[PDB]
Design a protein around this ligand. Sequence first.
Ligand SMILES: O=C(O)N[C@@H](CS)C(=O)O
Ligand SMILES: [Ca+2]
Lengths: 6, 223
Amino acid sequence: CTKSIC
Amino acid sequence: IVGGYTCGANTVPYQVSLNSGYHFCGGSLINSQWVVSAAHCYKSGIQVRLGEDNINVVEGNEQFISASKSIVHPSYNSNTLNNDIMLIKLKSAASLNSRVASISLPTSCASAGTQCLISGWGNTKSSGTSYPDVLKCLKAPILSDSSCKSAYPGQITSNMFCAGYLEGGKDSCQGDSGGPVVCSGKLQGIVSWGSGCAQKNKPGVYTKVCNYVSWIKQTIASN
Ligand SMILES: O=C(O)N[C@@H](CS)C(=O)O
Ligand SMILES: [Ca+2]
């Protein structure tokens, strides 16, 4: 699970 | 950042916010015209915001500069997250000052147990969501290779490391991606991924910057 905002 | 503390305005002067009409990722200033971030943060329309503390208020000492180039590692793999690194060139050079400053690249990799500073404007909750106005900070150690592989079997490449905690409560989180892991004054990591945030036995995973120093230098030199 990547840690950007989506 | 979950379980961290308010850094203090401009105490992390290499930390940038990547903004597309909202904060979506962090990054690290490495010279007056170049930022390091994560490949999975790539998109069009990136504005780099330097000098920030409260990202929702114009306080003074901000510089907003559009990206002119956004260069993902050619071998970035969006499924495995191997080579999760991107370079952003700024349309114009940032004005460097006490609040806007570059961070040095490593000359060697860091050892397990090295303490580092991880920072960002990401979610501060391990369950649910709360996005902070001001920059948050976390002191965190690099974990051993064996601990990292035990936490994420089959998923850790030589271009990744784990940092943080196994007891829960302290981690980077959504909105921190692309931002810095700084150890002894060197940019050793990029916030990349993990299983949730601040969960027991599931530390954060970070791109291992020391493997990319020559690539960074060559890419900057040719652009
Ligand atoms: O802090 C710096 O590096 N320069 C002064 C400007 S006189 C300031 O911006 O406060
Ligand atoms: Ca601001």
